[PDB]
Ligand binder design. Structure first.
Ligand SMILES: O[C@@H]1[C@@H](O)[C@H](O[C@@H]2CO[C@@H](O[C@@H]3CO[C@@H](O)[C@H](O)[C@H]3O)[C@H](O)[C@H]2O)OC[C@H]1O
Length: 328
């Protein structure tokens, strides 16, 4: 029963908007870039806060999607994680350390740790995966882009000296990069990145917000699923997809057009409130929470994403993003 690996015909239903910025003195414009896990009935979400003044991050939890908007926000600048530019989190449990990791950007590829996801006050001040700064290959190829959207995924090889931990990132210039280190060394020792995919003619076809997941029980050419956000010809965001037999393998398109996306306006049905034409920077809500980023596709995917009123006219950082949910 790999029932929910839908090949080239993915189909979704979206909720209305589920999470809004608070009406508090921070005057946040958008809630963005979610990462989420479900643990014994509680959803744990980390997201970016966005306004023209800057970016930081929030943590919140809830048990019912209809009540998510009422969840109190823990502003992570109150933890050692702290004030400053931080955005676009990914959360997973790194089992060999018995620590949760929060991977995100701060100008570099960064991470924080915490032994208990339920205690957001303990997230550490950032440490970076690239101690000397922006890698040469990224500085050489970024142009007028931005180094964004960091993603870790580890293979499940039992031997920690053979098992690899991969770190992907984008440049808003048409490149997708990948570094690696062994499980034994992680988070230390990330290699110089390599460009693994590029779209030089249309940079917007391979834009940002990459996700790489393991498909549980899949052992061949569709073992790994790559999602990347693209911008369509009328400015609407959607996700392209590819598959491979390994994380550092060759990626072959799966559902990779605007007309037939992994998720986009074309294949998402709003059965209730219809509030966005963009399906942007999202993540699958994971129940298998460890560093292998494994999805069980015997069950429907829930993908928490950011959407926005298509009629909004603001500067990009002031756009009124809200979180919503698509379900198979
Ligand atoms: O503060 C910086 C952020 O603004 C930045 O976010 C990216 C800004 O550019 C976005 O891409 C644009 C989308 O709309 C099109 O019309 C433009 O041509 C694009 O450039 C991108 O999606 C955002 O991630 O990230 C880095 C921050 O320092």
């Amino acid at each position: 029963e790999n029932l929910y690996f839908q090949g080239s015909s993915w189909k979704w239903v979206s909720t209305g908007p589920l999470v809004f910025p608070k009406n508090d003195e921070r005057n946040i414009a958008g809630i963005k870039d979610p990462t989420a896990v479900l643990i014994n009935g509680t959803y744990h979400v980390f997201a970016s806060t966005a306004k023209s003044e800057g970016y930081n991050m929030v943590y919140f939890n809830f048990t019912d999607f209809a009540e998510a908007n009422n969840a109190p926000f823990y502003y992570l600048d109150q933890a050692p994680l702290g004030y400053g530019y931080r955005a676009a989190p990914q959360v997973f449990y790194f089992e060999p350390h018995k620590l949760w990791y929060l991977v995100y950007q701060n100008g570099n590829a960064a991470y924080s740790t915490n032994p208990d996801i339920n205690d957001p006050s303990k997230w550490t001040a950032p440490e970076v995966f690239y101690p000397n700064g922006m890698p040469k290959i990224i500085a050489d190829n970024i142009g007028n882009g931005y180094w964004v959207d960091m993603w870790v995924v580890c293979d499940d090889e039992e031997d920690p000296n053979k098992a690899l931990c991969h770190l992907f990132s984008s440049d808003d210039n048409g490149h997708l990069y990948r570094s690696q280190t062994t499980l034994a060394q992680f988070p230390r020792g990330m290699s110089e990145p390599e460009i693994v995919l590029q779209d030089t003619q249309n940079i917007y076809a391979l834009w940002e917000a990459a996700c790489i997941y393991r498909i549980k029980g899949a052992e061949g050419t569709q073992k790994y699923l790559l999602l990347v956000e693209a911008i369509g010809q009328e400015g609407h965001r959607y996700f392209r997809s590819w598959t491979s037999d390994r994380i550092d393998g060759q990626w072959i398109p799966l559902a990779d057009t605007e007309a037939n996306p992994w998720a986009g306006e074309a294949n998402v049905v709003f059965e209730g409130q219809k509030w966005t034409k963009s399906i942007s920077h999202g993540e699958v809500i994971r129940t298998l929470t460890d560093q292998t980023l494994t999805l069980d596709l015997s069950e429907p995917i829930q993908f928490l994403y950011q959407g926005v009123d298509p009629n909004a006219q603001t500067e990009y950082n002031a756009l009124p993003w809200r979180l919503g949910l698509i379900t198979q």
